[PDB]
Short mmCIF file of C-alpha atoms in Angstrom, two decimals:
data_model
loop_
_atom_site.label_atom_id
_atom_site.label_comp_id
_atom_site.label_asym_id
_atom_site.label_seq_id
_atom_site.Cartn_x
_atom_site.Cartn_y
_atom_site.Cartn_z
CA UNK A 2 127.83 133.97 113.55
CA UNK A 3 124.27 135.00 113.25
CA UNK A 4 123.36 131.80 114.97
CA UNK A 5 125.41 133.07 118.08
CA UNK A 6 123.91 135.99 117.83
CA UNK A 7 120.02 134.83 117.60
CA UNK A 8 120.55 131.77 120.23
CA UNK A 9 122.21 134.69 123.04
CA UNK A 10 119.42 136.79 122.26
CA UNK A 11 116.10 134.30 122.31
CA UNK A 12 117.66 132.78 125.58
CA UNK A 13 117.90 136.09 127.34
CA UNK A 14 114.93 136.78 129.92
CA UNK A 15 112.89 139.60 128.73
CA UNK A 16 113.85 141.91 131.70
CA UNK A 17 117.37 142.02 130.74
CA UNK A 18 119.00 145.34 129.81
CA UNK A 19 121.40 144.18 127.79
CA UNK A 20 123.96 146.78 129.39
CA UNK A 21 121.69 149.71 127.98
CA UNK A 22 120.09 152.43 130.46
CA UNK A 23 117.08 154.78 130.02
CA UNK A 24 119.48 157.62 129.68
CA UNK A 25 121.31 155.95 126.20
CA UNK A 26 118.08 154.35 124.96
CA UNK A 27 115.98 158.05 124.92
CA UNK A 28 118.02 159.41 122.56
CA UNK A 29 118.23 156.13 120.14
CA UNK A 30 114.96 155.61 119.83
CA UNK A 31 113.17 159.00 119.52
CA UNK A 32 112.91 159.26 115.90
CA UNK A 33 111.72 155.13 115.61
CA UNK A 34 108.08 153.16 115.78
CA UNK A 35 105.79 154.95 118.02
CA UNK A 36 108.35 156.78 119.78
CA UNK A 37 107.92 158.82 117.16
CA UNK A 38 104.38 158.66 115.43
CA UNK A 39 102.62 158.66 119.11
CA UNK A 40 104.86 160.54 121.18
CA UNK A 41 106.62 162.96 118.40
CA UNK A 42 109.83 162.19 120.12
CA UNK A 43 109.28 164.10 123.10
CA UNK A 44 111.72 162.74 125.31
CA UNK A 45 109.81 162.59 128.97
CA UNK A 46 106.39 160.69 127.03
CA UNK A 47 109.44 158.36 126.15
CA UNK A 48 111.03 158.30 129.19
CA UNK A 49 107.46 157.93 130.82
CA UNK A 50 106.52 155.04 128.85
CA UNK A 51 110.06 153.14 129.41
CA UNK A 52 110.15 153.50 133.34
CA UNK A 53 106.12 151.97 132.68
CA UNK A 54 107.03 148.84 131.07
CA UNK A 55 110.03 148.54 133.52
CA UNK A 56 107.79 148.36 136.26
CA UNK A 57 105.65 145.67 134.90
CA UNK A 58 108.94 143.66 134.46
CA UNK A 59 109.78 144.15 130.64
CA UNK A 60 113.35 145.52 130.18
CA UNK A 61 113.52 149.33 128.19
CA UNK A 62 116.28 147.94 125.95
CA UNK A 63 114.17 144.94 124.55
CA UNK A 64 111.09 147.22 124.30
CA UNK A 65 112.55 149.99 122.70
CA UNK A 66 114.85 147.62 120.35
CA UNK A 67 111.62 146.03 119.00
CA UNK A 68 109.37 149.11 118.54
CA UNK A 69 112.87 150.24 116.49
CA UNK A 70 112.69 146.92 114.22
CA UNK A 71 108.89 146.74 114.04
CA UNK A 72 108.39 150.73 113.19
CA UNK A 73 104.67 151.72 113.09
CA UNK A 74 101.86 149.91 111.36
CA UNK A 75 98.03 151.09 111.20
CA UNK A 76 95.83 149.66 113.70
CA UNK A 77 98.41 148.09 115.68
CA UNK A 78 99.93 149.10 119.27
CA UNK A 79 103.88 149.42 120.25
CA UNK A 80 105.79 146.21 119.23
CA UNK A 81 103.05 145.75 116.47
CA UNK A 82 101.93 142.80 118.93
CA UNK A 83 98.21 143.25 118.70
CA UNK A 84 95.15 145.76 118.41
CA UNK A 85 96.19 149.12 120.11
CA UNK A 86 94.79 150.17 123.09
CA UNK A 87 92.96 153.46 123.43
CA UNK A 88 96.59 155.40 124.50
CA UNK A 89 99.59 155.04 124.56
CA UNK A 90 100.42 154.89 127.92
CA UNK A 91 97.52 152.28 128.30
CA UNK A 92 98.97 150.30 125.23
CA UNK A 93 102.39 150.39 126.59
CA UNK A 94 101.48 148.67 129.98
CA UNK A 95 98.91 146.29 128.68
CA UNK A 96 101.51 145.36 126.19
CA UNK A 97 104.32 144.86 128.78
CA UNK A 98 102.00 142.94 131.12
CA UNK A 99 101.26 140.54 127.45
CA UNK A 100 104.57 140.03 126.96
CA UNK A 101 105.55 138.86 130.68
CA UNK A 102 102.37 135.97 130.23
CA UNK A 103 103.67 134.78 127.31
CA UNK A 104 107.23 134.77 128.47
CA UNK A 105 105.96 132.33 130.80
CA UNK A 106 103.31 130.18 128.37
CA UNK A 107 103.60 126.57 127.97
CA UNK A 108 103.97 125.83 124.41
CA UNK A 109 106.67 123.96 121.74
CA UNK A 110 107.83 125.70 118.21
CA UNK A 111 105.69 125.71 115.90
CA UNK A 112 107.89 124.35 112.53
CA UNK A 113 105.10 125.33 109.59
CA UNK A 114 102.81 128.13 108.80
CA UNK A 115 99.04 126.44 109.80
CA UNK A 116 97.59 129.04 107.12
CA UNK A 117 100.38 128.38 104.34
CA UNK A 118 101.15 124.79 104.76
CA UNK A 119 104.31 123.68 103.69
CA UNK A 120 106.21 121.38 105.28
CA UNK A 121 110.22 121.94 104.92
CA UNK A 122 111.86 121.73 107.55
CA UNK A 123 114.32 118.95 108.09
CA UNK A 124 113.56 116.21 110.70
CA UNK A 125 117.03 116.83 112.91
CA UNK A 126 116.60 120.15 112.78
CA UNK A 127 112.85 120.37 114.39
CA UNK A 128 114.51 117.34 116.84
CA UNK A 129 117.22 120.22 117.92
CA UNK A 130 114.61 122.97 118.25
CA UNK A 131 112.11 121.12 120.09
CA UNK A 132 114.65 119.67 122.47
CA UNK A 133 116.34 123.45 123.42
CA UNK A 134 112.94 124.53 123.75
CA UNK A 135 111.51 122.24 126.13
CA UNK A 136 114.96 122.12 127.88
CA UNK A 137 117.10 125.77 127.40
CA UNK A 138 114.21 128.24 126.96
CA UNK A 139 113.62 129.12 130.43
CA UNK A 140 110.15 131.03 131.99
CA UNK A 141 110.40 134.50 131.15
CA UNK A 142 112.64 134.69 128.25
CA UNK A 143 112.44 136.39 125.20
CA UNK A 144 111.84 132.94 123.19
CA UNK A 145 109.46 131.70 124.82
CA UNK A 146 107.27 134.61 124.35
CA UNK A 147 107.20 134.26 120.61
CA UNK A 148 108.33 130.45 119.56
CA UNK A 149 105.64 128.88 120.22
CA UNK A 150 102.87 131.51 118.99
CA UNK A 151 103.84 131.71 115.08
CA UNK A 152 106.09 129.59 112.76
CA UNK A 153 108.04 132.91 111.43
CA UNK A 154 109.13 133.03 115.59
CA UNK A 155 110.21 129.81 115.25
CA UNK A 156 112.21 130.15 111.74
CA UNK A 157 114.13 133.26 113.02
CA UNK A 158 115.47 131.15 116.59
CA UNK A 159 116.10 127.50 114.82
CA UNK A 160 115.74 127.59 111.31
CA UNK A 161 116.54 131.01 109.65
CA UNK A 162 116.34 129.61 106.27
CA UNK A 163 112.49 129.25 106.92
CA UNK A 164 112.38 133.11 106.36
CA UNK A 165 113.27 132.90 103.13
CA UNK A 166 110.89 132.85 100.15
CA UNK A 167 113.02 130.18 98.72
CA UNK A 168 111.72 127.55 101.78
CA UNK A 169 108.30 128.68 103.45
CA UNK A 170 106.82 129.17 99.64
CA UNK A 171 105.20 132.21 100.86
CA UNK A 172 107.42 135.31 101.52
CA UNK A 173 110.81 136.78 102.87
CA UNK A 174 110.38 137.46 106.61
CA UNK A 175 112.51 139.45 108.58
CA UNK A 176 114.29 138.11 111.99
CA UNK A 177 113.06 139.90 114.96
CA UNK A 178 115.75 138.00 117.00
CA UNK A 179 118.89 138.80 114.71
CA UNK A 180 118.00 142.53 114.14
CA UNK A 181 117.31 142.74 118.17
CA UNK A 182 120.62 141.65 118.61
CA UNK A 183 122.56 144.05 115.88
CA UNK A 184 120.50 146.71 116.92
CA UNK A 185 121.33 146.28 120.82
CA UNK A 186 125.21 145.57 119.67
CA UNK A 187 124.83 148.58 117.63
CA UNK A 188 123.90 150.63 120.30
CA UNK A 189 126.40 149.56 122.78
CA UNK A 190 125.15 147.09 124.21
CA UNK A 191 126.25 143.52 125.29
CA UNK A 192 124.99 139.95 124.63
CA UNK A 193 127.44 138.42 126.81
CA UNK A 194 127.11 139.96 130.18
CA UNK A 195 125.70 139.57 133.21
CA UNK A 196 121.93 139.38 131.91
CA UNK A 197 118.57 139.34 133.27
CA UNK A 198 116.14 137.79 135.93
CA UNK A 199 112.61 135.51 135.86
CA UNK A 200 110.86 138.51 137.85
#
């Protein structure tokens, strides 16, 4: 029930806290992504930067849950989402503030890589994806932030086979959505609770 799993979790908004506090997350994530690299784990830089992207309306569960899955990469700020910033209390907040535009961006998936193009996809399934898109993925959820921006975004909510090798031609990629949602699970969270809000 991956499926389940990935649908629950692209459909949440991305201030929900998944039934995770501050207190639980510290402790998770210390050793992970930048947590660790940036801040060497010290638990009040954490705290510091999870109370930041709070504020800007980007929930401490889905932040920290992604800088977990991403890990650190050269060059790149928390969430490996673009160029880093010049620190990392400065890359934290512009990051948050990114992610609540894009939760909010206009768009429709995006069903083939424009810089590997191969078409594979089947035609009912890209019907199904466009049609929850336009119609389920509400402003300010976690799909809607990355569907429509890269083709691997939309593979991991509609069409996990995409990821593989076998179908996109190009490489394996991983599924940001599915590993948020073991990860959260993992932790002791929920997927099925009360949830979040478009603030």
């Amino acid at each position: 029930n991956d499926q389940e799993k990935i649908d629950k979790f692209t459909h949440s908004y991305i201030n929900d806290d998944f039934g995770l506090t501050i207190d639980q997350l510290v402790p998770k994530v210390k050793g992970y992504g930048r947590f660790n690299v940036w801040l060497g784990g010290n638990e009040s830089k954490i705290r510091q930067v999870l109370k930041a992207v709070k504020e800007i309306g980007v929930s401490p569960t889905l932040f920290a849950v992604y800088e977990k899955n991403e890990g650190f990469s050269s060059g790149l700020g928390w969430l490996n989402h673009t160029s880093a910033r010049g620190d990392y209390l400065t890359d934290a907040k512009f990051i948050a503030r990114k992610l609540v535009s894009q939760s909010k961006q206009a768009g429709q998936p995006s069903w083939y890589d424009a810089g590997n193009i191969v078409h594979f996809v089947p035609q009912d399934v890209q019907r199904k994806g466009n049609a929850d898109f336009a119609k389920n993925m509400k402003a300010g959820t976690i799909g809607r932030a990355y569907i429509p921006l890269t083709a691997a975004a939309t593979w991991a909510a509609y069409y996990p086979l995409g990821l593989k090798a076998s179908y996109n031609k190009v490489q394996n990629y991983g599924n940001p959505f599915l590993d948020g949602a073991n990860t959260i699970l993992a932790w002791g969270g929920k997927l099925d609770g009360k949830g979040g809000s478009p603030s």
